[PDB]
């Protein structure tokens, strides 16, 4: 983990010919990156500095992966032998389906390999995605300082647009701090400094949410805390009490002296070991008072366990970008999937044409648009390991019938994937009855193939494989599911059996304990039914709660199910692998998942989320209400909680009501919070999905993301969590429990 | 360090030679002040 | 053998101080004002609400003619209000953003300021007319004698009397240990008291620059002070939620205004015109007006939402203005 | 390498105390005894339409009638400032031009750009094709009928011979990109401004970097040479002009102001050397005084960024080329 | 490596033994030039419209 560092060849600049295939118009701009590592600004075509949020970059592909120009007007201008090493395209956008391109082209040699490697390092950096609150206000000040007009000054039409809840405050708050406050005038960029913009935001909003904290910690009449009143503010109110204090040591009066000397503005308080009120309104959104600690965000999990004991992020018919009937399949959707953190994709290989025999991808019997197979595996082998080095599981729906297309698609995977295609069993784990699967460590950097060795939609009419395609299937393998007592008696842990959403609900509730007892040895993927033709998603928490691994969603339509499966896989270093909790992967001590009581062996937790307030939540003057879900085992799932809608009074509302309790959660390393904040009228604003065993207690700022887990600049909440340990007709017995979870 | 404390000795020695005004006449004079101005008060 | 032989006398005469109070312990106001009827039930109403500030109001001060009031805020904006017609007469900005005091003149053509930047900046009625630097602590409260001399109270445990034509600490006062949070003048301006942070109320004589009387009694901070209008008694705030009433003639505390269901501490004290009422502020956003000679609540002035930071009746006692932390400086009557 | 660092820098402080020993009176002190020029206003006399994209460079002729311009379309156009008749129309083979020039004979017009190669046109077709820069070309100026000095982006300059087409002397010594250059009216020395804030003064006789000048804190975009031959004025991206001398080895004035923030693009002097016509980035050209450091009029006439200037040898008028395909001639 | 630092001293070596004149004469050479040429420069003072070719 490193803070975002800008290398010297990005701060000064290079010269890039920016072109666009739409209007066929290319300028000559000089790219820069500001020294914080926030924006990518260049002086525009009519002398107005554009930007691009560097956290809103999904990939920066260069070289042979880039987008070449197809218009001979632009092609004769840029000069199209080896000069496709100076190109650079920077894709962006909120969702996978909506991506914009910025087709640059460098003018000096070997300056595009340097840039596109050092822009992808700045877009996928953890500490500039889980950053502080005070960092996310310097990311909204640098946006205001870069975009000057032609004269070179900051226009006041931009400060009245960014903080635009009511512009009668901003016209007043600019006029009282000593700037030019008219609608058409300009502020010079060296009289609009960070000490002034900090004084701008204090005059803008009124903060009783902070001031309610300053009465409970003892600051009564003097405008400063002591060192002692802060040293037992952290160790009494903001310390996670599940953890062992011998390994996580409490705060010392020599260690808290640095927290004063890092934040306190005045000098008469710095030498006396005292922190003022502005020093405490700076500390609450500092880089130590975060909602999550940095042990549950980097690659720190026991990666030695076998492959049957992991949540693997996966997908279902991931080549589609629309509904399952009359959509349009693409090949860019794989690159956006495998970069997000997916680890199991789906390919529907169909028989090609009688002119020339090569396979391709489409949905069966729906006349959806077709993409060719050869360019899919090149869009897989390129970007399989750009964000996470942990193995990818291809999952064919082999529907062809000719023998020559079977061998041709076998020669493609042994050529495009190179040595990353696992064609041989490992030395340590051979395929015999009674062994376990490999670990992700020993498969790190490899690619497996899932195919038959030697309401289903289309996956039931599948063909018998041949001797060439069956050579690649080594560890993960599909076999038609017969029974449970046949599976455990046979004990081949290199088998798997797919289940649709319907036929796995008939086997979630009929016998859940034998399902988990089978899901410690073997695999079983879960993919939704064919009657969700608008590509909506079932909840994945239905089938993690019995320990299925590859629970598959539709990555194109981001409802609350797909906003879960990209907020619970942001942890463990965005690697797409999460370790199952201990009693779901251990061959001795089993448990019923539907337990209304606690289990002897898992410690239980208790949670009390209080949603106090939240700043800068919307562009228009309207009320905000906050929903606090908590998914988990079916005795943990509570989806009824909501605050009351505020009045929309100012930039920050204040909710003053009772906290939301979660008293007895039986399995807390499986549960996960969710704090969504809506507009009054169903319009989304933000959400953040937190795990339960890792969340700290105390007063924190939750900085909201959008619906695809990209950080929003301005909006946040100020919530107060309080975690602590716990001190105390078969179908309708179970179908009445899951109805809080199905929705 | 003793000169800080030797200021306090001259601080408290002047507290010995102060005339004692007892609370009998003094608190009744505070009683007599509220009665002599009892109708010149726009917050009653 | 020397550092111990002073402490035998450093607490010898202090025991003669309290034993002098036992010889003077004759009566309290509970046993001498028990035949005095109370004032009944006191109700007020929000007469005028002076919108126009942008952040927390931290101080105020009435004028001399009971008409104009100043109000320094936390955004750094002195506004000289007109109470009769709801008018912002001036609006002086500041070069010191963090303010904690304000003042006015007895003749009425000068204003002051102060705060965290250790500088007291007299203005003219608008440009920066003077500047007073020399404190090594935060400025907390400053008052005027006349058009020429100005007293302050600072965070470097020292009060200071200044001259406005030179701009130097002419007379400096020492003797507290903690911070000095508020001060007030006698109506003759012959002797002024101030309350510290470490639970003391010391009286400084202005003509000599040396204390003559030291009070005790509190167990926590002191955050306000104000005089009885005859100049022989005064009253403080606290953090332990009890105001007091000291006797400058009798050298002893006389009456505590303690009450149950009262946990928030005072942040502003000022008497009334005839000295029957003691008003106060709290952290329950109310403004409990206390009767003086009975030690009892008599009315609640509840019109705010965030805490009360300043309070004060006029020089004739007609109105009363409370300035809270919601930028809403009301006027009650 | 340890001994080389200190003995080099020890002479670099031998410059400063020698500079401080010379700096007895800066130029603002002596010129106070002379009245200023007051106000001077120029109007748009002619206007030159016919270009299609952004205009990058221009250079008047010594016969003081024609000029030239080099647009982003790769459309080199030779104008006539008397009748507004396009006398020729020369289409390039590389549309990324960045500069142009003009010869004192009037017979040769050069134009090069991002394509690293300084083409030379006859007055029509190319005669000589001068190549040898391994970076982009930024500015070139003619000496005479046969010699041209270019300024690449490979941190060098050059001194060509177009009858042969080979580089005679490689004027090296810069540490960053070379942005613009300017010959002398006696055609014996020239200057060069960089992206290292480093003006210089070379000589065409021997090939050595004769003097070196620093002082700015940003890039240097354009430098003009005084009509005496004694001074040269530069322009930086810190919104300032300065004025050096070859003898005083230091800045003599500093033509800055508040409410001027964006950079500069092109400067030049007048016929006498009294004015100093800068062309800024906020679309206006200012007129300073070379002695008084006060403004004397603004040429607020363009609608996009002003990117090149040039003042005739007869001193009749100036011309400003912008990014909106327009050449305005101001007198 | 060392040779670029060698020639950096050797280019700076001839910068040591340079000669100068005072700025009081340098600001007098410039001040002689403008006032001896201000009578004919057509940008300080305008010209008649007959001799002016752009009107
Ligand atoms: Ca399918």
Numbering used by the authors:
A (entry chain A): 13 to 92, 97 to 470, 576 to 849, 867 to 881
B (entry chain D): 8 to 51
C (entry chain C): 2 to 126, 133 to 340
D (entry chain B): 4 to 126, 133 to 340
E (entry chain G): 8 to 62
Which lines from the publication concern this structure?
pmcPhospholipase C-β (PLCβ) enzymes cleave phosphatidylinositol 4,5-bisphosphate ( PIP2 ) into inositoltriphosphate ( IP3 ) and diacylglycerol ( DAG ). Their activity is controlled by G protein–coupled receptors (GPCRs) through direct interaction with G proteins. PLCβs are cytoplasmic enzymes that must access the membrane where their substrate PIP2 resides in the inner leaflet. They contain a catalytic core, a proximal C-terminal domain (CTD) with autoinhibitory activity, and a distal CTD with structural homology to a bin-amphiphysin-Rvs domain important for membrane binding. In this study, we demonstrate that Gβγ activates PLCβ by recruiting it to the membrane where its substrate PIP2 resides and by orienting its active site.
We reconstituted Gβγ into liposomes consisting of 2DOPE:1POPC:1POPS at a protein to lipid ratio of 1:15 (wt:wt) and incubated the liposomes with purified PLCβ3 prior to grid preparation. We determined the structure of the PLCβ3· Gβγ complex to 3.5 Å and observed two Gβγs bound to the catalytic core of PLCβ3. One Gβγ is bound to the PH domain and the first EF hand, referred to as Gβγ 1, and the other is bound to the remaining EF hands, referred to as Gβγ 2. Both interfaces are extensive, with the Gβγ 1 interface burying ~800 Å2 and involving 34 residues, (16 from PLCβ3 and 18 from Gβγ ) and the Gβγ 2 interface burying ~1,100 Å2 and involving 44 residues (21 from PLCβ3 and 23 from Gβγ ). The Gβγ 1 interface is mostly composed of hydrophobic interactions, with three hydrogen bonds, whereas the Gβγ 2 interface is mostly composed of electrostatic interactions, including 10 hydrogen bonds spanning the length of the interface. The distal CTD is not resolved in our reconstructions, suggesting that it might adopt many different orientations on the plane of the membrane relative to the catalytic core, in agreement with previous studies showing that heterogeneity in the distal CTD increases upon Gβγ binding. Only small rearrangements occur at the Gβγ binding sites. Both autoinhibitory elements, the Hα2' and the X–Y linker, are engaged with the catalytic core consistent with previous proposals that Gβγ does not play a role in relieving this autoinhibition. Unmasked refinement of our final subset of particles from the liposome structure yielded a 3.8 Å reconstruction showing the PLCβ3 · Gβγ assembly and density from the membrane. The two Gβγs and the region of PLCβ3 between them are closely associated with the membrane and the remainder of the catalytic core, including the active site, tilts away from the membrane. 3D classification revealed four reconstructions capturing different degrees of tilting of the catalytic core ranging from ~26° to ~36°.
